[PDB]
């Protein structure tokens, strides 16, 4: 009878999802986060469930944690949504965060290093949407992001498998965005790069060397790193109800790099 | 003290509402509008009746609305008012145009003189009148309304859609420009929006026969509420997000897509 | 000796591939075509190769066939590279046409559905890719020409999976053609729809038609479907060696459908 | 009979190389361009280096100077000298634009008026006049060169890439808008062109120090040359593709990929 949505945040053991958590926990949701399960010393894992869970709590949100489902298959994405739908009965948000990064010159790359691509930044796409979409098409009402990337926007040099099929994913969400409208359905894609998080600082090989940071900070017309505050608070406007009049679109998140 | 935001046209669109909610927001505001009673022609709420609310919000409210903003005298007086009042300018919600539509080859010499007035000489005179405040404090966040019709020109909205387009280049060459100076600017173009003048225009007002086929055009199967407009448009000159510049935001329920 | 390049055009028995390779004769190219062995009874094939080698050698141009290899995995692309190299020496020029077309509801869409888009629409221009490039960037020039489809600029409703894929294959050609571009090697898109050969007649239902077939070229700004003697026209001048100033980039040729 | 293709500001640019291969593909020619010889400011190929070659290659040729490009005056009369000579217009090559870099803040009010006319109001009237004979004849080609900065705006080039902008959404919208008439409108934007006026506006000219660095800024790494962009322009004027309207390419060795 408290008939409160629930938002769906995958990856949410870092990147975005545990800022993005707590402001929909603010605005009124339940929440499922999939993620990796473990301690704040488990790889990959920036803000653990026990974590999470206590601070979503304390807040007053109902939680549900999914671990170790692969969301690059029907069978792990199927999963997953049927254990939302049988804990809260209703799916009214989706942040599907997708993808697996490689890098390298084009003529470098082997089938092992495309089939992950595609598996990362397609398959997580078309599976995801797949799972999400029927609870919001049955209610006649949802909210999804993918998180896809701002090199999905401008695929250059040395990302070309990574950042053309990140603008595969960016189309697919345009057409599935649109078609699903008249059901009261938006879907949207955010790409960021240039984020202040360790799997950035990774790839970038900024991680523990300031003159690294530095020369990357440059690169970006903003002149810094962009915040999960920051960001987690332009996905959640996506989410949360209060903005429902876009959809099968791409925005960018990059200090103006892909502008 | 307060931050300051600056909204023009405020008496009509979207700025009522967000000046609602940048006053919740914890800013001051300037409003430039129309003089009036929400009778007169272009006054959907009157500063009068804003200026009551936006006081119980906390918000110190200036209104300036004797000002032609398609020249540089009129918006350098408009900044000019601005930091006598209140020292500052963090943020600035500029809306522009004139709308023109037909056939291409009917429009006349003032038909295409008034589409660059309102859809580009108010950009260039606007952002020339409130950038160098924002660049001298080292911060500063700008949204210049343009038109959905910018991201997608088509026939009979030559001249109008394709001068809005204009102004979105404008505004990313502008906003990548400004951007090291710790400076936003961004553009957002609607199409498809709940307010009287395009109830009006479209002959949506009051008749709900028509206003379904025009909700028909629209992949979202609606039209637009100010407060969504206004929430987003605030997401952008609130402090909240300062990591997009030189971008055009489409509006549309989809139709920009 | 005759310095003659050397043009390779796959799916040659149908679409643009016998126009083009008419036109390419005439410029003074050597040619390989990949496509379907078979009369012009056989299913596809619009000019077998019997009837275009006949006509091809009479314009002085040598021809390589390449019949029934399967140009959706590595083998089948290096396969038709290591003929090209030891037929000719050399390879100057590539259109890669690709593709697999599947439409429906996202929603509807199967695993296999999803598999076969991906081979047709990115496997198809991976392995393409990997394939042509390394003899032009071992020469300092080529010039290739990718078949997406117009879907690609704006995938829409209904074309959720083709449109989205095609949007990848063309970003992959942004980031390869501005990476090669060092080696002087052009790799472009193009984008078609509303073409006038069967392919497109089926997908669309318009063959035998004329009430459907009008309603479909009624779509079109320029209201008729596009003739192969005007993309040949448009692909032969991005293949010919008088334009080697546009790469990375991706053209729409619809009528205005994709403007 | 010979169809006919208008060329303008044709002592430059692509006009003689497009002249040429017009020539070749059975055309008769209208260029406008700038009276005197090759010393005078901008004329590459004076008209009178010209015509020996174009009446070899089979062409008339009538030659136009001093009328203003940036007016309806001069644009109306333009065509109207064209089908009192030829009865026929088929093609049309509108080169459009003025030049204006530097910092969006500094710019004049005079900059802002010179961008407009070269890039905007040039489009507008030299569409306004070329589209009707072709809308009654029921057929005909037009290209209208904008520049490659209208794909990407960017900073020091606010004006000027955001004006282009604005010329290539009119061109969209005006190409989509005569589609049904068999008419195509497209428009072609390059930079980094091996000519005077890119040359000087890079400060490259005569320097091959500066030339080299900015020929790194290109990724095919070199200035693109007449011969290239007069065979492009040419297969969207010669009557052998008439299906691609509305739309603008981009010609700039990738740099607006
Ligand atoms: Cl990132
Ligand atoms: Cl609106
Ligand atoms: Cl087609
Ligand atoms: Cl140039």
Redesign the interface.
Same mark, same amino acid.
């Given at each position: 009878a408290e008939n409160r949505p629930v938002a769906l945040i995958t990856m949410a053991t870092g990147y975005v999802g545990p800022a993005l958590a707590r402001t929909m926990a603010d605005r009124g949701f339940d929440l499922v986060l999939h993620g990796t399960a473990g301690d704040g010393t488990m790889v990959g894992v920036e803000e653990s469930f026990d974590s999470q869970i206590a601070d979503l709590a304390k807040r007053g949100a109902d939680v549900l944690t999914i671990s170790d489902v692969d969301l690059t298959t029907?069978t792990g994405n199927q999963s997953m949504i049927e254990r939302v739908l049988e804990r809260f009965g209703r799916l009214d948000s989706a942040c599907l965060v997708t993808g697996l990064i490689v890098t390298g010159?084009?003529?470098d790359?082997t089938?092992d290093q495309?089939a992950k691509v595609?598996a990362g930044n @397609?398959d997580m796409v078309?599976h995801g949407?797949?799972a999400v979409?029927?609870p919001m098409?049955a209610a006649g009402a949802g909210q999804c992001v993918v998180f896809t990337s701002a090199t999905?926007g401008?695929?250059?040099?040395?990302?070309?498998?990574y950042?053309?099929?990140?603008?595969?994913?960016?189309?697919?969400?345009?057409?599935?965005?649109? *078609?699903?409208?008249?059901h009261?359905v938006?879907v949207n894609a955010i790409g960021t790069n240039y984020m202040d998080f360790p799997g950035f600082l990774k790839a970038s090989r900024a991680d523990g060397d300031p003159e690294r940071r530095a020369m990357i900070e440059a690169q970006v017309?903003?002149?810094?790193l962009?915040?999960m505050? *920051? @960001?987690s608070?332009?996905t959640a406007?996506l989410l949360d109800g209060?903005?429902?009049?876009?959809?099968?679109?791409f925005?960018?998140?990059?200090?103006?790099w892909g502008?």
């Amino acid at each position: 009878a408290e008939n409160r949505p629930v938002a769906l945040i995958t990856m949410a053991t870092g990147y975005v999802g545990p800022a993005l958590a707590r402001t929909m926990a603010d605005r009124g949701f339940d929440l499922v986060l999939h993620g990796t399960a473990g301690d704040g010393t488990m790889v990959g894992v920036e803000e653990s469930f026990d974590s999470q869970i206590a601070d979503l709590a304390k807040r007053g949100a109902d939680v549900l944690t999914i671990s170790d489902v692969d969301l690059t298959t029907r069978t792990g994405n199927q999963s997953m949504i049927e254990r939302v739908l049988e804990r809260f009965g209703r799916l009214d948000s989706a942040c599907l965060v997708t993808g697996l990064i490689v890098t390298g010159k084009f003529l470098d790359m082997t089938d092992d290093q495309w089939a992950k691509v595609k598996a990362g930044n @397609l398959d997580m796409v078309f599976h995801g949407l797949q799972a999400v979409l029927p609870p919001m098409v049955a209610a006649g009402a949802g909210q999804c992001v993918v998180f896809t990337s701002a090199t999905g926007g401008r695929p250059d040099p040395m990302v070309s498998i990574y950042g053309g099929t990140r603008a595969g994913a960016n189309g697919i969400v345009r057409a599935v965005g649109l *078609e699903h409208a008249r059901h009261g359905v938006q879907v949207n894609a955010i790409g960021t790069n240039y984020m202040d998080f360790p799997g950035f600082l990774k790839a970038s090989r900024a991680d523990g060397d300031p003159e690294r940071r530095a020369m990357i900070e440059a690169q970006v017309p903003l002149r810094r790193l962009g915040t999960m505050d *920051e @960001l987690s608070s332009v996905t959640a406007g996506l989410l949360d109800g209060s903005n429902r009049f876009q959809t099968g679109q791409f925005f960018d998140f990059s200090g103006g790099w892909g502008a």
